[PDB]
């Protein structure tokens, strides 16, 4: 076998770290490179700064100009908040300098103190020696910024430029006789970034002044890239107003500029294994089983420093740049290979106390993954994420072609293939139209690596790769240390449009795509066979507008325990009992699926638009993660949302979470007070259906009719009966307060509607009708539609506030229930302590409807409506009619 020294030398040219295991050896090499770079920077900066004033204040209307490759580029002015206000470039052997504002117009005023240091910078630009005079009348070409202001700027610094009187950016012969090229964002050119890089490499020295305040500049971004620099994030220096004060010493400035982008102290710590044993872990707090340590002193600053390395490397991942195909990238390459070597040695699980050195180095190496390369290495141990099935997944030797629908203007969607660990994958987009695309790997949210919990650092921190930009009809080569599910990220797309995806070298995880109204009998049998082969650790299910990214063993667990091995019924109930139930309850336009007859009739009798795709279009993809861990708790809300028990079509948590992404403010009582209440109609309706379809009684005690009754009879005794019942029921700001008592309000109307239609099966239609009503209120043309919607008295469309101190949800619910029931429902709103605005009371008044006297529906069960008892509440409060 070769030596690790021979392995590392060969890995440095190609990127093939497969056989690279000696991370201390790679770390010694990095240490040698970092010290060389720091010595070179400290010579250059000492010459530039001398002992002149460092004072430099670019103001709020300016931009940050950052280095990129640490071996070619470095800061010039770092502010006291650590923002890089100007950067030096030596890209491609040239000399360049970039300012985040037009410092040349400020040398006679707000930045007079910077003028001598700028003189030295130009002298370094023009001659490569900060202490060598420029020649009298040296030729300066000024492009993209006012020539007179720029030249007088240089004259204010004590230089004596002469106007080159030609464009050294676009005119090659001007460039060979100009001594300096000053650039701003007014430039014009074809291939603006390549041209800049070429003048720089031919030896034209370039000074760049950002001319657009705190705005970004597309032209400035291209100029910066040509110099091997990059523009700061959106907003620039507006908030921070960073600057360099007079108090700044040269020594301090030299120290920061020597270290920037190569964290020397971290390299020393990695070489020496001198990781901390004294973190005060007692300062960690738990929250629904999720330990975090943001208050352990020192930890946040250690985390921030590692984030910086991750940001620097991921910038190349996101641009689809392969550092191993770029010249002069030794430092970056070393960082990436060291991390690849650490990944060979990782063993799980680790503990933040019992295993500090392995924990802390792993924490660093997890943040340094280079994804754009022709070869790389698999991490040996994949811990709680995956195992031997993922490692040994077979890959396709030939190019596969997939057609993908992008259902919305922006999002991501599962491609249906996986990167295998350490196996080169090549991907290509075609037929994109106007959509902008990127490929990504996996969908884990970062909270689901529970590395702060005792002995739970058992998987990588960053299983979801950064989004890797794809340009149409240009292949990109990927190697992932982990393997992962391939996502396509898109923006500016046309809903319903297709994309073509070509990919070579990818694995095929079990994949099921069903679309409403088509023949899936083949796709399902394909999917069962893949499940039975037991070749993969991860799978995906696309069904309608729902994408499930799931650990195989979690789903087979749910199919064995709750469905007895019957995959077919599992899929039917996933589609029909869970997904369709919710989206039908919410009255979305489901393809090939008409509205039920009693909904169609109500909508027609009211002259409502209940079918147009513009008002009732299905929302975008809802994503679900089924994993060993969650962002927060055992399950966390969002898109994707997380769950850890498995996947149960009849499960309460499944419909609760989907319900959250279907909440609308105008159907919430007291705003956030109903934040964990109004989405509950989806699990509630599912359970009522499950008891009547299948005879299974799930969660029969969730709706606390008895206790809501108790809080109601008490509050209504007060001298303000509304404000009375309110403070018992809705005042409590606890995010799960009175949760089963507040649900009793929402189901009140189901029982009421069921009676009103004289049909026990129609009660839930009221929420569908309110959902249809709500979307018309939200989106329809106001003047033309407010009449039919029961909003005729409103000059303007009502508000959509979610605040608990708003009436907007109370109002809409009162109006919608009153319009739909054709009864004034203010007595029952007051009985529940629901205060509505005078405009909404004005509107209900104008209906000229018979008052519905305050009522209450009581029951001793949640799911069985046949035992429900109606109480007249208008003349006092009757007794609880059970037993």
């Amino acid at each position: 076998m070769a030596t690790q020294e021979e392995i590392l030398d060969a890995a440095l040219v190609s990127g093939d770290s497969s056989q690279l295991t000696d991370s201390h050896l790679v770390a010694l090499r990095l240490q040698q490179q970092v010290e060389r770079i720091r010595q070179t920077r400290t010579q250059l900066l000492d010459g530039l700064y001398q002992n002149l004033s460092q004072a430099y204040d670019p103001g709020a209307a300016s931009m940050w100009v950052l280095p990129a490759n640490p071996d070619n580029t470095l800061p010039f002015l770092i502010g006291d908040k650590g923002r890089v206000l100007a950067s030096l470039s030596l890209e491609a052997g040239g000399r360049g300098l970039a300012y985040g504002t037009n410092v040349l117009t400020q040398l006679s005023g707000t930045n007079a103190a910077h003028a001598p240091l700028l003189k030295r910078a130009v002298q370094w630009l023009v001659n490569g020696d900060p202490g060598a005079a420029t020649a009298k009348d040296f030729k300066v070409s000024v492009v993209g910024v006012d020539k007179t202001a720029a030249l007088n700027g240089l004259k204010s610094a004590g230089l004596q430029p002469a106007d080159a009187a030609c464009n050294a950016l676009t005119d090659a012969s001007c460039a060979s006789t100009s001594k300096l090229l000053v650039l701003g964002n007014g430039a014009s050119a074809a291939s603006l970034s390549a041209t800049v890089r070429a003048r720089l490499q031919a030896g034209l020295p370039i000074l760049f002044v950002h001319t657009n305040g705190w705005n970004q500049s597309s032209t400035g971004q291209q100029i910066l890239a040509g110099l091997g620099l990059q523009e700061g994030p959106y907003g620039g220096n507006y908030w921070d107003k960073d600057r360099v004060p007079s108090s700044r010493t040269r020594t301090r400035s030299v120290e920061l500029g020597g270290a920037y982008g190569q964290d020397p102290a971290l390299v020393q710590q990695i070489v020496d294994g001198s990781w901390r044993t004294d973190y005060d872990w007692s300062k960690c707090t738990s929250y629904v089983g999720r330990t975090t340590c943001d208050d352990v002193p020192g930890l946040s600053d250690f985390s921030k420093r590692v984030d910086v390395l991750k940001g620097a490397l991921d910038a190349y991942n996101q641009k689809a740049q392969n550092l191993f195909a770029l010249p002069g990238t030794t430092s970056l390459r070393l960082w990436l290979l060291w991390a690849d070597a650490v990944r060979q040695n990782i063993r799980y699980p680790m503990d933040k106390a019992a295993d500090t050195a392995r924990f802390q180095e792993t924490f660093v190496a997890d943040a340094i993954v280079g994804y754009v390369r022709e070869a790389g290495a698999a991490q040996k141990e994949l811990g709680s994420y995956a195992g031997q099935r993922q490692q040994s997944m077979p890959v396709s030797g030939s190019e596969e072609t997939l057609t993908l629908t992008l259902p919305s203007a922006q999002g991501f969607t599962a491609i249906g293939r996986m990167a295998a660990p350490g196996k080169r994958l090549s991907i290509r987009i075609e037929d994109a139209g106007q959509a902008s695309l990127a490929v990504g790997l996996n969908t884990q949210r970062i909270g689901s690596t529970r590395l702060w919990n005792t002995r739970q650092y058992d998987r990588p921190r960053f299983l979801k790769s950064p989004d890797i930009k794809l340009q149409a009809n240009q292949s990109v080569a990927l190697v992932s240390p982990y393997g992962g599910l391939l996502q396509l990220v898109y923006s500016g797309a046309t809903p319903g449009q297709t994309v073509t995806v070509k990919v070579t070298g990818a694995a095929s995880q079990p994949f099921l795509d069903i679309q409403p109204g088509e023949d899936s009998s083949q796709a399902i049998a394909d999917f069962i066979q893949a499940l039975d082969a037991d070749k993969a650790d991860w799978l995906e299910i696309r069904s309608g507008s729902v994408e499930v990214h799931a650990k195989v063993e979690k789903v087979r667990g749910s199919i064995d325990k709750d469905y007895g091995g019957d995959v077919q019924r599992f899929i039917r109930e996933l589609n029909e009992v869970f997904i369709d139930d919710a989206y039908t309850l919410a009255g979305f336009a489901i393809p090939n699926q008409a509205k039920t007859p009693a909904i169609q009739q109500e909508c027609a009798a009211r002259g409502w638009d209940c079918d147009s795709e513009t008002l009732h279009k299905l929302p975008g993809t809802q994503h679900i993660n089924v994993d060993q861990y969650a962002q927060c708790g055992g399950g966390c809300s969002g898109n994707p949302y997380d769950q850890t028990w498995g996947l149960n079509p009849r499960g309460w948590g499944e419909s609760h979470q989907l319900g959250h992404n279907l909440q609308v403010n105008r159907l919430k009582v007291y705003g956030g007070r109903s934040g964990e209440i109004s989405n509950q109609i989806f699990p509630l309706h599912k359970d009522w259906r499950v008891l009547r379809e299948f005879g299974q009684n799930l969660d029969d005690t969730r709706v606390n009719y008895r206790n809501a009754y108790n809080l109601i009879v008490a509050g209504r005794a007060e001298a303000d009966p509304l404000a009375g019942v309110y403070k018992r029921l809705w005042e409590d700001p606890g995010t799960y307060a009175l949760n089963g008592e507040r649900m009793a309000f929402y189901t009140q109307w189901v029982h009421y509607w069921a009676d009103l239609k004289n049909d026990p099966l129609q009660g839930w239609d009221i929420w569908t009708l309110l959902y249809l009503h709500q979307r018309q209120v939200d989106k329809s043309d106001w003047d033309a539609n407010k009449a039919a919607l029961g909003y005729g008295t409103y000059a303007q469309r009502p508000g959509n506030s979610g605040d608990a101190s708003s009436t907007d949800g109370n109002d809409n619910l009162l109006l919608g229930l009153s319009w739909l029931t054709q009864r004034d429902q203010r007595p029952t709103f007051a009985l529940w302590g629901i205060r509505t605005s005078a405009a909404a009371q004005a509107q209900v008044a104008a209906y000229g409807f018979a008052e519905q006297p305050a009522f209450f529906y009581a029951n001793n069960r949640t799911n069985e409506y046949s035992t429900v008892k109606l109480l007249d509440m208008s003349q006092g409060s009757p007794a609880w009619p059970f037993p």
């Binding site: 705190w214 959106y234 907003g235 620039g236 507006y238 908030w239």
Partner: peptide, 5 residues
């Protein structure tokens, strides 16, 4: 103008 926070 101002950037949106």
């Amino acid at each position: 103008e101002a950037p949106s926070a």
